[PDB]
C-alpha cells in the first residue's frame, strides 16, 4: 500500500508542477496576446483614418441598433456582415429576395448591435481633436425614426453617447489657451429656435457645458426636427486656430416635414450640378453648408433598425447612404 | 503513514482538477485571442496597402546634394524649390526648368527623412509585397550615399535592415517566424555577378519553381541570415566586391504554423548605374528598358518586355500587380552637370504626365 501510495503523490505532484507551469506558459501567452491586440487595433484605426483623410470623401458610418427588450417578438431580417465596412440585409420573405435582390452596402465602418457607445465614439474622436487643431468638424445622424440617432448622438444616462463623450475629449485634450463657444438650436417646422434667431453663451467649466447641454436638451409626430449643436474652439497660447464641432440630429426621413429631402438634393449636387447647389434651399443645409462643401470633415451616422417592418425604410436609409459616402470633399 | 500520503492524493487530484479546468479556461481565452489577433492584423495589413495605394503604388522622388567639401567653389545652379514636390533648376553659361515629384529632397534633407518613403514599405514588404527601391542619377549625383549611405549616415539599405530585424521580431508575438534570403549582384553589360563570392561565374535568369512568374538566378550565392551579425557580416562582404547595377534582394519569407499561413515578400534595393551621356573610350540600355518598363505599367499595359534587359527580367516579378517602386533620382547641385540633371529629372516628367 505504501509503494503504491508513493507511486501516485509521485505522479500527481509532477502532474501538478508540471500542469502549474503550464499554466504560467498561457498567462504569459495570454498577458502576450492581449498586448499585441491592443497594439494591432489600434494600428487599423490610426491606419483607418489615414485612408478617409487621403480618400476626402465625407466619412460614413453605419450603426444597425439591437432590439430592445421590449419588442422581443418583433421579427427581424437577415443580416450578413462581410466585414467591417459592408454590410447587406435580405427580407424575410423570398418573392422579394429574387427580384432584386443584392441589397448590399460598403461604407467606412460598420457598427454591429453589438457595439457599444465608446466602440463609437473611438471612430470619432479622432476628428473631435483634429477641431482644436484648426479643422471645422461636423456630424449628424441620418435614420428612421426608432433606428438610434439620439441614442448614438446623445445617448442615455446610464451609457453616454457621442456629443457628451464629446466634451470628455475636447478638454482632456487642452490639458496653450482655448476657449469654447456652445451652441444650441432646433427647426421644428423651418425655423431656428433656443437661444438663436442671436446667439449663444461661452463655455467655462467640463460641468457647465455638461450642464449648458443638458439644459437645451430640456423644452424637447413628435421629433420632427433637427437638433443641432455648434461648439467653435479657439486657440491662443501667449496665430489663433479656429475650428467648430457641429452636432446634428436630423428628424427621420421616413414613409410619411419634409427638410431632409433638400438635403439629398444637396448630396447630388456635391458630384453633379457643380453649377448652382441647392444649398440655400434648406435652413438646416444652411447651416451644415460649411461642411457639405467648404474645408470641413463630416462624419454622418446612418442608423438602421434589425426590424423586417422596416426593411423598405432601412434600404432607403442605407442606399441614400451610400451616395454620400461618395461626395469628394474638398477640404 | 499510509493515511498522510493517503489525504495528500486526495487534495492533490482536487489540485490537479482545479488546475486542469484553469487552464482549460486559459486555453479557449487564448484561442479567441489568437483568432482575432490574426483576423486584426489581416486587416492591419489591408489598411496598410490601400494608404499605399493611395499615395502611389510608384512614386519618384527627387533628393539633390550638397556641395562637397573638396570645392567650395565649383558652380551651383539656380535651384529654386516650388513647392514639396515642385522643384526648377537654372544653368548660368548654356523653355523653362521645373519639375514635379511625390516629394522633392533638398541638400539639406537627411538619410532618416529619405528612409521615411522607405519604412512604410518595408512593413508592406513583410506582408507579402515586392517592393522596389530605386536610385537613379548621374556618377556623383548620390546614389550610392542614398542607397548604401556612409558609416557617418546609413542609408536606405542599412536602415532597412534595422527596420527589418526588429520588425521581425515583433512579428513572433503573434506566431511569425520570419526568414531572409539575402542575395547581392552586380549588373555589368547585361552580364549578372555574385557579390558574395570571389569564383568567376555564370547566372542566368531562369523562371522560379513555383511560379513562372517569379525569378530566379542559377549559381547565386543565396544566404539565409542567421542573425543581424551575419547579414551585416554579408553586406560588408558583399561591398568590398561604377557603369554597372547593383541590387541587393531581401526575400521575407514568414510562416506562422499555428495558422499554416505563409507571408513571402521581398524589398530590392537597387542603386542604378549613371544615367549620364558616354563619349568614346551599353548600359544606357537596360537604364531605358528600366524607367519604360516603368513608365509601361504606369500606362497600364498589357505586353511588357520585362525579358529585354537583365535588370527588368530581374525585378520582373516586383515591377507590377500589388508591388510599389520608389524612384530616388539623385542630383547633382552644378552648372557642369545641368544637362544630366535636367535628363535625370526629365523622367519624373514621363512619369506624372501619365495622365
Ligand atoms: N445602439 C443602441 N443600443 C441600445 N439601445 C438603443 C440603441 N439605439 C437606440 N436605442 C434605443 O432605441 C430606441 C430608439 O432610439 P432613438 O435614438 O430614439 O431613435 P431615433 O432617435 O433615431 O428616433 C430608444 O428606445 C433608444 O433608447
Ligand atoms: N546627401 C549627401 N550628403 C553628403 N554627401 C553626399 C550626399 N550625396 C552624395 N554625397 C557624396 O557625393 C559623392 C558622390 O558619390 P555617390 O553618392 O556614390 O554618387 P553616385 O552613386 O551618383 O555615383 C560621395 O562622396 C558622397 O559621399
Ligand atoms: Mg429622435
Ligand atoms: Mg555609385
Same mark, same amino acid.
Given at each position: 500500500?505504501?509503494?503504491?501510495? =508513493?507511486?501516485?503523490?509521485?505522479?500527481?505532484?509532477?502532474?501538478?508542477?508540471?500542469?502549474?507551469?503550464?499554466?504560467?506558459?498561457?498567462?504569459?501567452?495570454?498577458?502576450?496576446?492581449?498586448? %499585441?491586440?491592443?497594439?494591432?487595433?489600434? &494600428?487599423?484605426?490610426?491606419?483607418?483614418?489615414?485612408?478617409?483623410?487621403?480618400?476626402?470623401?465625407?466619412? #460614413?458610418?453605419?450603426?444597425?441598433?439591437?432590439?430592445?427588450? =421590449?419588442?422581443?417578438?418583433?421579427?427581424?431580417?437577415?443580416?450578413?456582415?462581410?466585414?467591417?465596412?459592408?454590410? &447587406?440585409?435580405?427580407?424575410?420573405?423570398?418573392?422579394?429576395?429574387?427580384?432584386?435582390?443584392?441589397?448590399?452596402?460598403?461604407?467606412?465602418?460598420?457598427?454591429? /448591435?453589438?457595439?457599444?457607445?465608446?466602440? @463609437?465614439?473611438?471612430?470619432?474622436?479622432?476628428?473631435?481633436?483634429?477641431?482644436?487643431?484648426?479643422?471645422?468638424?461636423? @456630424?449628424?445622424?441620418?435614420?428612421?425614426?426608432?433606428?438610434?440617432?439620439?441614442?448614438?448622438?446623445?445617448?442615455?444616462?446610464? +451609457? #453616454?453617447? #457621442?456629443?457628451?463623450?464629446?466634451?470628455?475629449?475636447?478638454?482632456? +485634450?487642452?490639458?496653450? &489657451?482655448?476657449?469654447?463657444?456652445?451652441?444650441?438650436?432646433? @427647426?421644428?417646422?423651418?425655423?431656428?429656435? $433656443?437661444?438663436?434667431?442671436?446667439? &449663444?453663451?461661452?463655455?467655462? $467649466?467640463?460641468?457647465?457645458?455638461?450642464?449648458?447641454?443638458?439644459?437645451?436638451?430640456?423644452?424637447?409626430?413628435?421629433?420632427?426636427?433637427?437638433? #443641432?449643436?455648434?461648439?467653435?474652439?479657439?486657440?491662443?497660447?501667449?496665430?489663433?486656430?479656429?475650428?467648430?464641432?457641429?452636432?446634428?440630429?436630423?428628424?427621420? *426621413?421616413? *414613409?410619411?416635414?419634409? *427638410?431632409?429631402?433638400?438635403?439629398?438634393?444637396?448630396?447630388?449636387?456635391?458630384?453633379?450640378?457643380?453649377?448652382?447647389?441647392?444649398?440655400?434651399? =434648406?435652413?438646416?443645409?444652411?447651416?451644415?453648408?460649411?461642411?457639405?462643401?467648404?474645408? =470641413?470633415?463630416?462624419?454622418?451616422?446612418?442608423?438602421?433598425? /434589425?426590424? %423586417?417592418?422596416?426593411?423598405?425604410?432601412?434600404?432607403? *436609409?442605407?442606399?441614400?447612404?451610400?451616395?454620400?459616402?461618395?461626395?469628394?470633399?474638398?477640404?
Amino acid at each position: 500500500m505504501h509503494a503504491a501510495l =508513493s507511486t501516485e503523490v509521485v505522479h500527481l505532484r509532477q502532474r501538478t508542477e508540471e500542469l502549474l507551469r503550464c499554466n504560467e506558459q498561457q498567462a504569459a501567452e495570454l498577458e502576450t496576446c492581449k498586448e %499585441q491586440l491592443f497594439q494591432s487595433n489600434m &494600428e487599423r484605426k490610426e491606419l483607418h483614418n489615414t485612408v478617409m483623410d487621403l480618400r476626402g470623401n465625407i466619412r #460614413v458610418f453605419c450603426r444597425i441598433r439591437p432590439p430592445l427588450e =421590449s419588442e422581443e417578438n418583433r421579427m427581424c431580417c437577415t443580416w450578413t456582415y462581410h466585414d467591417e465596412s459592408t454590410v &447587406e440585409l435580405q427580407s424575410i420573405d423570398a418573392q422579394a429576395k429574387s427580384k432584386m435582390g443584392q441589397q448590399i452596402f460598403s461604407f467606412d465602418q460598420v457598427f454591429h /448591435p453589438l457595439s457599444s457607445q465608446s466602440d @463609437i465614439f473611438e471612430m470619432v474622436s479622432p476628428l473631435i481633436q483634429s477641431a482644436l487643431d484648426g479643422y471645422n468638424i461636423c @456630424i449628424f445622424a441620418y435614420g428612421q425614426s426608432g433606428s438610434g440617432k439620439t441614442y448614438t448622438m446623445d445617448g442615455v444616462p446610464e +451609457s #453616454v453617447g #457621442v456629443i457628451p463623450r464629446t466634451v470628455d475629449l475636447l478638454f482632456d +485634450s487642452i490639458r496653450w &489657451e482655448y476657449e469654447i463657444k456652445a451652441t444650441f438650436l432646433e @427647426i421644428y417646422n423651418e425655423v431656428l429656435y $433656443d437661444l438663436l434667431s442671436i446667439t &449663444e453663451e461661452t463655455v467655462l $467649466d467640463p460641468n457647465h457645458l455638461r450642464h449648458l447641454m443638458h439644459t437645451a436638451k430640456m423644452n424637447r409626430r413628435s421629433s420632427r426636427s433637427h437638433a #443641432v449643436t455648434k461648439l467653435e474652439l479657439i486657440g491662443r497660447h501667449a496665430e489663433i486656430s479656429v475650428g467648430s464641432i457641429n452636432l446634428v440630429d436630423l428628424a427621420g *426621413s421616413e *414613409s410619411p416635414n419634409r *427638410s431632409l429631402s433638400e438635403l439629398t438634393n444637396v448630396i447630388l449636387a456635391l458630384l453633379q450640378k457643380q453649377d448652382h447647389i441647392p444649398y440655400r434651399n =434648406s435652413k438646416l443645409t444652411h447651416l451644415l453648408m460649411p461642411s457639405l462643401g467648404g474645408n =470641413s470633415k463630416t462624419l454622418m451616422f446612418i442608423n438602421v433598425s /434589425p426590424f %423586417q417592418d422596416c426593411f423598405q425604410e432601412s434600404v432607403k *436609409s442605407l442606399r441614400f447612404a451610400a451616395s454620400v459616402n461618395s461626395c469628394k470633399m474638398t477640404k
